[PDB]
Design a protein around this ligand. Structure first.
Ligand SMILES: *[C@@H]1O[C@H](CO)[C@@H](O[C@@H]2O[C@H](CO)[C@@H](O)[C@H](O)[C@H]2NC(C)=O)[C@H](O)[C@H]1NC(C)=O
Ligand SMILES: *[C@@H]1O[C@H](CO)[C@@H](O[C@@H]2O[C@H](CO)[C@@H](O)[C@H](O)[C@H]2NC(C)=O)[C@H](O)[C@H]1NC(C)=O
Ligand SMILES: *[C@@H]1O[C@H](CO)[C@@H](O)[C@H](O)[C@H]1NC(C)=O
Ligand SMILES: *[C@@H]1O[C@H](CO)[C@@H](O)[C@H](O)[C@H]1NC(C)=O
Ligand SMILES: *[C@@H]1O[C@H](CO)[C@@H](O)[C@H](O)[C@H]1NC(C)=O
Ligand SMILES: *[C@@H]1O[C@H](CO)[C@@H](O)[C@H](O)[C@H]1NC(C)=O
Ligand SMILES: *[C@@H]1O[C@H](CO)[C@@H](O)[C@H](O)[C@H]1NC(C)=O
Ligand SMILES: *[C@@H]1O[C@H](CO)[C@@H](O)[C@H](O)[C@H]1NC(C)=O
Ligand SMILES: *[C@@H]1O[C@H](CO)[C@@H](O)[C@H](O)[C@H]1NC(C)=O
Ligand SMILES: *[C@@H]1O[C@H](CO)[C@@H](O)[C@H](O)[C@H]1NC(C)=O
Lengths: 46, 49, 219, 164, 46
């Protein structure tokens, strides 16, 4: 499963297994039993 | 249940502990004391001047 | 002068009821058979870890204590007073007389000369024991009033002290004093250390006896 | 400000109150109300008295605390009484019934009938026969005495006769 | 009527062991409290 989107530069630590935050508590969640990789790269030039 | 806990389709005569049992809480209650200091904000929000 | 407590300064260390049992605690107590100062009638004492404080009379010469680190302005302190009316707890920044007292006309209170920035108020022979302690911004006070059949000497016996007050102040304390009613028309000071005791509980739930477990090999 | 009653809004007087909550470093202070409820006795409930949290059945008692004492506990230090902070009455706490379940089988090579024992439970909380080992369901209590066949306990045994 | 120590000792040993078993339900073993309703009230599931 490739989940692809764009976020604010701050809550890149909000995509992680097990956490609390306004991005993680309302718009996207990962289980604490996560197994996979998370890749993030900057974008204001696109 | 006996057949499950004994892991067998045959059981022999006897008495067998199979599970536990317990009564569940019907509801919830909360208790504390009365009220004598609920603050009277009717002096700062209810002043004449 | 100095005197010897015998079994004195035991307080209920929690709110828990207990029927006929023997319960073991670790806390700050006044060790058995201790060396308690004697005062007659007074000066600035230390605090350093809680205080036992008894007193004896039929009149009322002991009229409360004053606490704190500097007993003046520039830092906060407590003040506990009793005129012939009733108790007056108070927490401001004060300016305390170096020899503060109250008279007995019956006009009095040369205690302080300043009451600034008050952060807490409150208004409303004999042997009168008190235990004062100060933990996590709370200033706890235990007390007991037993009747002696003497006038002003420290007796012998067992009597557990019941909690009175609780004040969420935050105040720092390093020193304390006393207040007396002058003449115009006896008290002791122990200190508390971390000990381990064995308290015997009655069937009504009162402490009737105790054992200090660091006195001797038998204990 | 010369305020006058015939002023357009935005020139009429407004009263303002600014609440500022501060947190120095004391031990505590003002907080919001503490919602409560009624007093249900003789049922397994989840209680909460001031912060004392547990579950069980609450009855009225014959203890007498000391005016400053707020709850009782026994040897092994389990809470077995409490004071409720509005009536000023002390209440006994009893754990909510529990136990084991055993099934009495005459052997599957003989029948499919079973009896069930609920260990040290009164019969009301579950033909039906009360022993000292618990409550027994599905077995008839005869009056004759045989040799023991399946031990139930406290002097009682069970057996498959005649068919039941 | 005025000696049964061998019978008293086996009673005492069993009671002393059963009490030690219950008195262990109030040790932390290196945790923040001894109550599960206190770790399930000031900590998130992870
Ligand atoms: C100030 O006092 C007045 C009067 O006691 C309070 O006004 C009441 O408000 C409630 C709810 O809006 C009404 O149901 C009552 O009818 C009002 N009182 C009267 C006498 O009619 C007002 O709430 C108080 N202000 C504050 C902030 O508590
Ligand atoms: C708690 O408050 C209630 C009232 O809000 C008190 O209830 C009264 O209790 C007395 C018994 O002492 C009765 O005679 C009254 O009829 C009760 N009045 C009401 C309105 O219930 C109760 O006593 C208070 N208890 C404590 C410990 O403060
Ligand atoms: C208390 O300590 C002082 C310190 O010098 C000593 O002189 C006195 O004898 C002691 N009193 C007792 C009762 O041990
Ligand atoms: C007793 O002392 C307190 C201390 O401020 C004072 O408020 C009170 O008025 C005094 N009593 C009388 C009768 O004045
Ligand atoms: C305490 O009192 C002094 C002098 O009256 C004053 O300068 C200071 O502001 C007061 N403290 C606070 C927190 O206002
Ligand atoms: C009490 O005094 C000590 C001095 O070592 C200080 O560090 C501490 O902060 C003071 N207490 C409070 C509550 O500030
Ligand atoms: C208190 O204890 C005494 C003796 O232990 C007992 O006789 C009495 O019934 C108890 N309860 C009271 C005095 O209410
Ligand atoms: C069990 O069942 C088998 C098959 O019916 C039978 O041969 C055997 O005798 C039975 N065992 C008994 C009755 O003890
Ligand atoms: C079981 O419950 C009944 C109903 O109250 C009661 O009368 C009885 O004493 C309890 N115990 C036994 C052994 O029956
Ligand atoms: C068992 O015998 C007793 C004799 O005391 C009698 O009361 C009871 O009813 C009998 N029960 C049955 C099931 O026969």
């Amino acid at each position: 499963y490739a989940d692809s989107f764009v976020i604010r530069g701050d809550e890149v630590r909000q995509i992680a297994p097990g956490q609390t935050g306004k991005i993680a508590d309302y718009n996207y969640k990962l289980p604490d039993d996560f197994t996979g990789c998370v890749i993030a790269w900057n974008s204001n030039n696109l | 249940e006996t057949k499950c806990t004994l892991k067998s389709f045959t059981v022999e005569k006897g008495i067998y502990q199979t599970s536990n049992f317990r009564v569940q809480p019907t509801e919830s209650i909360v208790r504390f004391p009365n009220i004598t200091n609920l603050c009277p904000f009717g002096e700062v929000f209810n002043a004449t001047r | 002068a100095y005197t010897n407590s015998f079994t004195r300064g035991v307080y209920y260390p929690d709110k828990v009821f207990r029927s006929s049992v023997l319960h073991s605690t670790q806390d700050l107590f006044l060790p058995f058979f201790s060396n308690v100062t004697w005062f007659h009638a007074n000066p600035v004492l230390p605090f350093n870890d809680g205080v036992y404080f008894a007193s004896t009379e039929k009149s009322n010469i002991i009229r409360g204590w004053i606490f704190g680190t500097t007993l003046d302005s520039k830092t906060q302190s407590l003040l506990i007073v009793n005129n012939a009316t009733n108790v007056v707890i108070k927490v401001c920044e004060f300016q305390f007389c170096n020899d503060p007292f109250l008279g007995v006309m019956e006009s009095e209170f040369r205690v302080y000369s300043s009451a600034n920035n008050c952060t807490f108020e409150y208004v409303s022979k004999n042997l009168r024991e008190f235990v004062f302690k100060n933990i996590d911004g709370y200033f706890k006070i235990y007390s007991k009033h037993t009747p002696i059949n003497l006038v002003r000497d420290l007796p012998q016996g067992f009597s557990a002290l019941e909690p009175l007050v609780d004040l969420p102040i935050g105040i720092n304390i390093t020193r304390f004093q006393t207040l007396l009613a002058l003449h115009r028309s006896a008290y002791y000071v122990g200190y508390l250390q971390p000990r381990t005791f064995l308290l015997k509980y009655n069937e009504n739930g009162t402490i009737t006896d105790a054992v200090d477990c660091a006195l001797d090999p038998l204990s | 400000y010369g305020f006058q009653p015939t002023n357009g809004v935005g020139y009429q007087p407004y009263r303002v109150v600014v609440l500022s909550f501060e947190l120095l470093h004391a031990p505590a202070t003002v907080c919001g109300p503490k919602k409560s409820t009624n007093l249900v006795k003789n049922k397994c409930v989840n209680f909460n008295f001031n912060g004392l949290t547990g579950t069980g059945v609450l009855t009225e008692s014959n203890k007498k605390f000391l005016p400053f004492q707020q709850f009782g506990r026994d040897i092994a230090d389990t809470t077995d009484a409490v004071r409720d902070p509005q009536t000023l009455e002390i209440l006994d706490i009893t754990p909510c019934s529990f136990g084991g379940v055993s099934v009495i089988t005459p052997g599957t090579n003989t029948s499919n009938q079973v009896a069930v024992l609920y260990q040290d439970v009164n019969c009301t909380e579950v033909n039906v026969f009360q022993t000292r080992a618990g409550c027994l369901i599905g077995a008839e209590h005869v009056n004759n005495s045989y040799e023991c066949d399946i031990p139930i306990g406290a002097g009682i045994c069970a057996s498959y006769q005649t068919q039941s | 009527s005025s000696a049964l120590g061998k019978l008293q000792d086996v009673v005492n040993q069993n009671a002393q062991a059963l009490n030690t078993l219950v008195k262990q339900l109030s040790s932390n073993f290196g945790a923040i409290s001894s109550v599960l309703n206190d770790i399930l009230s000031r900590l998130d599931p992870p």
